[PDB]
Design a protein around this nucleic acid. Sequence first.
RNA 1: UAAGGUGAUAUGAACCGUUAUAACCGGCGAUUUCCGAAUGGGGAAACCCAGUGUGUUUCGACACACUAUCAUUAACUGAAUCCAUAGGUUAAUGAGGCGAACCGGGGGAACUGAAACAUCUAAGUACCCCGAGGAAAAGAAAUCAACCGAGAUUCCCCCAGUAGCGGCGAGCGAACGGGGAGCAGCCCAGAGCCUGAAUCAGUGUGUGUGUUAGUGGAAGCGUCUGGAAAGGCGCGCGAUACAGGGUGACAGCCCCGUACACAAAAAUGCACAUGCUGUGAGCUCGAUGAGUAGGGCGGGACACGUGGUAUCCUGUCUGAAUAUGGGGGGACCAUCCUCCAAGGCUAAAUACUCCUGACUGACCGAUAGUGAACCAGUACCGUGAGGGAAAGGCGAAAAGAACC
RNA 2: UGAAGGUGUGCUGUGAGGCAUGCUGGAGGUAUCAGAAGUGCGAAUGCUGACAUAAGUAACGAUAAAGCGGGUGAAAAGCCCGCUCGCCGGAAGACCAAGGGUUCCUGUCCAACGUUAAUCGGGGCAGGGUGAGUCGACCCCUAAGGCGAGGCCGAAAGGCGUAGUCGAUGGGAAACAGGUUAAUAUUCCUGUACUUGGUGUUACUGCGAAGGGGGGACGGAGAAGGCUAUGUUGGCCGGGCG
Lengths: 62, 46, 93, 77, 103
Amino acid sequence: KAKELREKSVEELNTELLNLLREQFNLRMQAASGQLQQSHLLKQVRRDVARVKTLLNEKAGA
Amino acid sequence: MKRTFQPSVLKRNRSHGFRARMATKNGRQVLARRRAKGRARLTVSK
Amino acid sequence: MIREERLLKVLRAPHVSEKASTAMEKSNTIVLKVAKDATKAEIKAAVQKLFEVEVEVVNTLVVKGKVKRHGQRIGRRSDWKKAYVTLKEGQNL
Amino acid sequence: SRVCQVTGKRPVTGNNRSHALNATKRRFLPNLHSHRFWVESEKRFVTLRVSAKGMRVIDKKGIDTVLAELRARGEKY
Amino acid sequence: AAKIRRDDEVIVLTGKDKGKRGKVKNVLSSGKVIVEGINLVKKHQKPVPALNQPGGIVEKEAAIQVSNVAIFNAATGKADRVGFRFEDGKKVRFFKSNSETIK
RNA sequence: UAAGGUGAUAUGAACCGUUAUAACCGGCGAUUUCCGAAUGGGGAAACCCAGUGUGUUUCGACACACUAUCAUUAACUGAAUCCAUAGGUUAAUGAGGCGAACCGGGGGAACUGAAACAUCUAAGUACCCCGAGGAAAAGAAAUCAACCGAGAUUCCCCCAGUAGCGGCGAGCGAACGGGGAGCAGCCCAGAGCCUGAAUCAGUGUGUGUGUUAGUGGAAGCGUCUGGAAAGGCGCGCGAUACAGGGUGACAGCCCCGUACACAAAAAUGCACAUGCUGUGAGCUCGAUGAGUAGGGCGGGACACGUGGUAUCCUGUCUGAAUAUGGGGGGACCAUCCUCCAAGGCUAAAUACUCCUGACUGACCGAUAGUGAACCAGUACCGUGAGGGAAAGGCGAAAAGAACC
RNA sequence: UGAAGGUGUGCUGUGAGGCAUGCUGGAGGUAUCAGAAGUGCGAAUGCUGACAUAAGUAACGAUAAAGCGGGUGAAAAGCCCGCUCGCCGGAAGACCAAGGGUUCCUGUCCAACGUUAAUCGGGGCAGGGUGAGUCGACCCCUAAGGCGAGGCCGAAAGGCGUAGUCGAUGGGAAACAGGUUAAUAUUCCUGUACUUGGUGUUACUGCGAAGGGGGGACGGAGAAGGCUAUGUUGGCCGGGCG
Ligand SMILES: [Cu+]
Ligand SMILES: [Cu+]
Ligand SMILES: [K+]
Ligand SMILES: [K+]
Ligand SMILES: [K+]
Ligand SMILES: [K+]
Ligand SMILES: [K+]
Ligand SMILES: [K+]
Ligand SMILES: [K+]
Ligand SMILES: [K+]
Ligand SMILES: [K+]
Ligand SMILES: [K+]
Ligand SMILES: [K+]
Ligand SMILES: [K+]
Ligand SMILES: [K+]
Ligand SMILES: [K+]
Ligand SMILES: [K+]
Ligand SMILES: [K+]
Ligand SMILES: [K+]
Ligand SMILES: [K+]
Ligand SMILES: [K+]
Ligand SMILES: [K+]
Ligand SMILES: [K+]
Ligand SMILES: [K+]
Ligand SMILES: [K+]
Ligand SMILES: [K+]
Ligand SMILES: [K+]
Ligand SMILES: [K+]
Ligand SMILES: [K+]
Ligand SMILES: [K+]
Ligand SMILES: [K+]
Ligand SMILES: [K+]
Ligand SMILES: [K+]
Ligand SMILES: [Mg+2]
Ligand SMILES: [Mg+2]
Ligand SMILES: [Mg+2]
Ligand SMILES: [Mg+2]
Ligand SMILES: [Mg+2]
Ligand SMILES: [Mg+2]
Ligand SMILES: [Mg+2]
Ligand SMILES: [Mg+2]
Ligand SMILES: [Mg+2]
Ligand SMILES: [Mg+2]
Ligand SMILES: [Mg+2]
Ligand SMILES: [Mg+2]
Ligand SMILES: [Mg+2]
Ligand SMILES: [Mg+2]
Ligand SMILES: [Mg+2]
Ligand SMILES: [Mg+2]
Ligand SMILES: [Mg+2]
Ligand SMILES: [Mg+2]
Ligand SMILES: [Mg+2]
Ligand SMILES: [Mg+2]
Ligand SMILES: [Mg+2]
Ligand SMILES: [Mg+2]
Ligand SMILES: [Mg+2]
Ligand SMILES: [Mg+2]
Ligand SMILES: [Mg+2]
Ligand SMILES: [Mg+2]
Ligand SMILES: [Mg+2]
Ligand SMILES: [Mg+2]
Ligand SMILES: [Mg+2]
Ligand SMILES: [Mg+2]
Ligand SMILES: [Mg+2]
Ligand SMILES: [Mg+2]
Ligand SMILES: [Mg+2]
Ligand SMILES: [Mg+2]
Ligand SMILES: [Mg+2]
Ligand SMILES: [Mg+2]
Ligand SMILES: [Mg+2]
Ligand SMILES: [Mg+2]
Ligand SMILES: [Mg+2]
Ligand SMILES: [Mg+2]
Ligand SMILES: [Mg+2]
Ligand SMILES: [Mg+2]
Ligand SMILES: [Mg+2]
Ligand SMILES: [Mg+2]
Ligand SMILES: [Mg+2]
Ligand SMILES: [Mg+2]
Ligand SMILES: [Mg+2]
Ligand SMILES: [Mg+2]
Ligand SMILES: [Mg+2]
Ligand SMILES: [Mg+2]
Ligand SMILES: [Mg+2]
Ligand SMILES: [Mg+2]
Ligand SMILES: [Mg+2]
Ligand SMILES: [Mg+2]
Ligand SMILES: [Mg+2]
Ligand SMILES: [Mg+2]
Ligand SMILES: [Mg+2]
Ligand SMILES: [Mg+2]
Ligand SMILES: [Mg+2]
Ligand SMILES: [Mg+2]
Ligand SMILES: [Mg+2]
Ligand SMILES: [Mg+2]
Ligand SMILES: [Mg+2]
Ligand SMILES: [Mg+2]
Ligand SMILES: [Mg+2]
Ligand SMILES: [Mg+2]
Ligand SMILES: [Mg+2]
Ligand SMILES: [Mg+2]
Ligand SMILES: [Mg+2]
C-alpha cells in the first residue's frame, strides 16, 4: 500500500491518518465490547497507521 | 524483645539507594561490581 | 485545545461490572478503562467529542495489577486507570 | 597542592633509615613560598607559589620569560 | 528449495507403509510431511463440551520424515530423485532418472 | 529467496500467500517512551517542578524548540582605579560516562622465609589512584669495546645459576660476547639561493581483492531378520565429493551437506592507480639545548645491602666549560680510545582477548564439566558490601490412554 | 538371531582376577600388542544425596470453657444458623502513622499449607473492589544536617566551604451533617457551605523589591475561674400489666 500512499499529498496523508485513527478507535471499542469477530483488522489498521507515518516522515525530509 | 531490623523506607533509600550509590566513587564501584556479576536487582531502590 | 489524535488514544474500553452497571442506572455515570497517563480534562474532552454526550465531571483512580502464577512462573498484571464519568442529566449512552 | 609553579617540584617519597637500617616510609617536601613578583612590563605584582630553587630560576631567566612558560603550559597565575 | 512440495505424489521409502503412494497434504517446517492416507494413528479423542462433542477413537494421519518419501515418477512407475536447473530463467525441478522436468 | 506463513511456552481464533509488496535472509534508512554520564532546577533512579522563544486556540488551553558544567577561542561589556586588569554576558568547538586483559605513570603492604627476629626476604608482588592505544612503552649513542672493532629500540635462544651481591645467612643474581626474529631513519634550536621538486595527512574518483544475503552440486536396487534397516546376503553405481549431521538399529548413492564451480542492488575493509588541499624537497653558509653537567647533605635505582663503589634519579643547598670544549671507559690519576647531555618525532619484530567465524582435542559427561546443560547470578540468606544453591533423559512417532 | 549396565548360576587360577551362561536390559562394545593416567576407599568429629534408630515415644504453643438442637455435606467437637454458658472491656474494643502489599469482597476447590478433622481459612483458582479544589502527598518555607559554581587545601583518590540548593520530626488556604456498596467514601448521592487563583466589566485610586520595619515567634512549674464533651435524674412520648 506504500506505492499508492506515496502518490498522495501531505494533506491527503494527514486526512488518511486521521481516518485510520478513528477506525482504530472504533475497532478497539468493538473488540472491548466483544462485538468484533475479525480480530485481524486490529493489526491491519495498526500497520497502516505505521505506513502513513513513515511516508509523512519521508516527505518531510526526515 | 526489640530486634535489630526496624524498617524505614526513607532510611533504606538514603543509606543504600541508587542515588546514594552514585554519589561516591566507591558506591559506583559497588554498582560496577554488581553489574559485572549480573545482578537482577542492582540496589534496594524499589 | 487537545488535539483529536490525542483524544483518540485516551479511551481504551468500557468497564463492565455490577458496580459499573449500578452507576449507569442510578447516577448516570459510565465507567471506562482509560490510558494510564490520561488526565481528567483529556477524558472529558474525549468523551464529549467521541461519544457526543455532555459530561458533568470525571473522577479517576489507578488500579494496581495483581501478582499471578502460571506454571510455577510468577508475573504481575499491569496497573491501569479507571474513570467514573458523570454525564449531564438527560444524556444517554 | 604542594607544587612549585615554576619548576613543577612536588613531594617525593623515600625512606628514613635508622642506624640499624630499619626503613620507614617518609616524604621529602619542596621548599615552597608564596611570593609577590614585580612584573615591570605589566606594572603590577603577580603572586606565585614557588620553591626557593624556582626563585633562583626567576632571578636567572627573568619573570617575563617564566610567565610566558607558564602561559604555554596552561598554568594560571 | 524443497524437493518435496505440497500436492506432490510420493511413494513411501521406509517404515510400516513402505511402498504405498499418496499425495502430500502438508509440509511441516520440522522436515516432516502429511501424506494422504499413509501414516495413520488411532487418537483417543476426549469429548469437548465447549463445541460439539464427537469424543471417540479417530483415525488420522501423522507426520512422517520427508526423507522417508520419494517423488514418484509415473512414467517409470518408481521412486525418483529431484534435481534443480534453470529453464527460461526460472528454477525448475527434474527427475534424475530420465532428466524430465517435473510438472 | 520463496510455497508456504502470522517468534517460544501453545493448542486455538481471525487471517495472509502460492510466480511475486505472504513469510524468511542481507545492505541502507525511518521510528526509537522513561531512568541512567543524564546535561533546564531538584530528587528517596525510572519521579516532582520550571524559564524563554516560536507558533495554534473553540480562551479552557495545546504543540514544538532551546535552557547543565568545565576548557579553549572570539565578540560585547566592565570594579576598587586614571589608563587597565579582575569580573559579567553571549557564541563556536571540545570534554565527561562505560568496558575482561594487555600498556605507561603516581602511591604501596603483610602473612611468609630466614627453622626465633630487627638488617635481609616475601616484592615494587597484592591492592588503591591517574592516563592512553590497538597495541603501549622504547628508540637513532654524551652506547659498548679494547688499541681489533661494533653501530637506534624491541623480542627469542645462549652466556650462567657463571661474575658478583649477601646478618657473605636465608636468599638475590648480571654483563661482555655469540646465534636468531625484525629492520629505518628523521626534524627544530636559521638565513640566503633555488624554488613548490620527495615525503606523509586529509578528501573524491576508478581497478582489483575480501566482508555483510545467496546458486548449482554425483551415484541403489533385490532379498533375510525385524516394530522399523541404514544391518546380513547378492548384484550395481559416484568420487577433485568416504569432512560432518539427520532419518523408526550401523547409509558414499533417502535428506541436509561435502569437493568443485559460481553470485551483489547497497554499505564497508584493504591494496594500487589517479585527481584536489595542506606539508614542504635540494645546495651554500652558519648555529649546536645552563640554574644544566659537576659538587655538599638526605634518600632512591642499578644483580651490586656504602662497601675501595664507578654509573643513573633528585627533596635540600650550590654551580661550570661551552668544540681551543665537554661525557664515558666500575674508587682515583696519567695516557689512549670512544662518544657529544641538558630539544623532539619514528613502522616492524613484542603483550593481551570483553567480542565474531571456522576447526581441533589419548579434555568433562549431570556429586563431573562453568556457580549455572534446566527461565542462575535465579530461589534463598544478609541493613549492606556481599554470599549463593538444588534441579537433565516417555516414545521412532503423542499414537499422552475414547469407553466401562 | 540382542551391546554396555543390572541380577543369578557353573567353571577356573597362588592372588588382584578371568571365562561361560539363564533372566533383566534395549544400542552399543572391543581382542592382541603397545601408549597415557582425574587408575582402585571403611575410616580423615571427611563432602553430597538417600535411608535408619530412638518411636508410633515426646509434643500439638498460655488452665478464658464449654453444652445442646437444626443445616450443609461422603464425612461435622472445630464450618453456618439458634439458644445457653464462660472470657476481655484504659481492651482481648474502635481508629491512625510506620511497616507490609491484595492479605480486602464474592464464587468455587480441599492435593499441599493449617501442629488434629475440615464442608472452614490470611491456603489454590477465577471474577470483582480503592471515585476528592477542602483528607494526605506533591507544593511554598525553613531546623539539625547534606551537597555545593567560583574558592581555599591536599601525591592521586579527595578534604573544607562561600554564593546557593536541598532536607521535617516544625511554620503555611478551604467541608460539614445525613444516606448509600458484597467490598470506597469528609472522595459517590441529598442538603447546606467554604478557600485560593486567572480572566472580563463597573467604581474609586500612587503603584512598584533581591531592600527597611512589624508579625509569624515559641521555657518549666503552679493556681483558679468560666465552660463544653459527657453522665445522672426528672418531665415528655411510645410500649407493658408479667
Ligand atoms: Cu592542591
Ligand atoms: Cu558535561
Ligand atoms: K542509616
Ligand atoms: K536528564
Ligand atoms: K616481615
Ligand atoms: K620458622
Ligand atoms: K615467633
Ligand atoms: K640466617
Ligand atoms: K634470577
Ligand atoms: K538390505
Ligand atoms: K530416510
Ligand atoms: K550418512
Ligand atoms: K655506588
Ligand atoms: K645539582
Ligand atoms: K675525550
Ligand atoms: K560457587
Ligand atoms: K554446582
Ligand atoms: K573365584
Ligand atoms: K554374569
Ligand atoms: K547381560
Ligand atoms: K585396544
Ligand atoms: K566417612
Ligand atoms: K519409628
Ligand atoms: K498413634
Ligand atoms: K503450628
Ligand atoms: K480430628
Ligand atoms: K478462598
Ligand atoms: K544548615
Ligand atoms: K545549607
Ligand atoms: K474569581
Ligand atoms: K511563663
Ligand atoms: K427518662
Ligand atoms: K410475676
Ligand atoms: Mg521507625
Ligand atoms: Mg484521586
Ligand atoms: Mg508489566
Ligand atoms: Mg619494608
Ligand atoms: Mg541533575
Ligand atoms: Mg540540553
Ligand atoms: Mg534533567
Ligand atoms: Mg526546586
Ligand atoms: Mg577607570
Ligand atoms: Mg575516559
Ligand atoms: Mg621466620
Ligand atoms: Mg628483589
Ligand atoms: Mg581507540
Ligand atoms: Mg609509541
Ligand atoms: Mg617517544
Ligand atoms: Mg677506531
Ligand atoms: Mg669488560
Ligand atoms: Mg542449494
Ligand atoms: Mg546432492
Ligand atoms: Mg519382516
Ligand atoms: Mg532397504
Ligand atoms: Mg533402538
Ligand atoms: Mg541412530
Ligand atoms: Mg648538544
Ligand atoms: Mg646532580
Ligand atoms: Mg659523585
Ligand atoms: Mg649523593
Ligand atoms: Mg642509595
Ligand atoms: Mg654524568
Ligand atoms: Mg669517570
Ligand atoms: Mg659498567
Ligand atoms: Mg639527566
Ligand atoms: Mg588472535
Ligand atoms: Mg572464540
Ligand atoms: Mg554442576
Ligand atoms: Mg546419571
Ligand atoms: Mg564404557
Ligand atoms: Mg563407553
Ligand atoms: Mg595395557
Ligand atoms: Mg582417585
Ligand atoms: Mg563408600
Ligand atoms: Mg584404611
Ligand atoms: Mg556425630
Ligand atoms: Mg534422624
Ligand atoms: Mg521410651
Ligand atoms: Mg510416656
Ligand atoms: Mg503426652
Ligand atoms: Mg508447651
Ligand atoms: Mg492451641
Ligand atoms: Mg452440633
Ligand atoms: Mg473447640
Ligand atoms: Mg456458634
Ligand atoms: Mg494471594
Ligand atoms: Mg477474607
Ligand atoms: Mg490437615
Ligand atoms: Mg479426608
Ligand atoms: Mg484466599
Ligand atoms: Mg465530585
Ligand atoms: Mg489540607
Ligand atoms: Mg561541602
Ligand atoms: Mg568546585
Ligand atoms: Mg527548599
Ligand atoms: Mg512534617
Ligand atoms: Mg471497610
Ligand atoms: Mg522580614
Ligand atoms: Mg513554634
Ligand atoms: Mg509552659
Ligand atoms: Mg452539657
Ligand atoms: Mg450538646
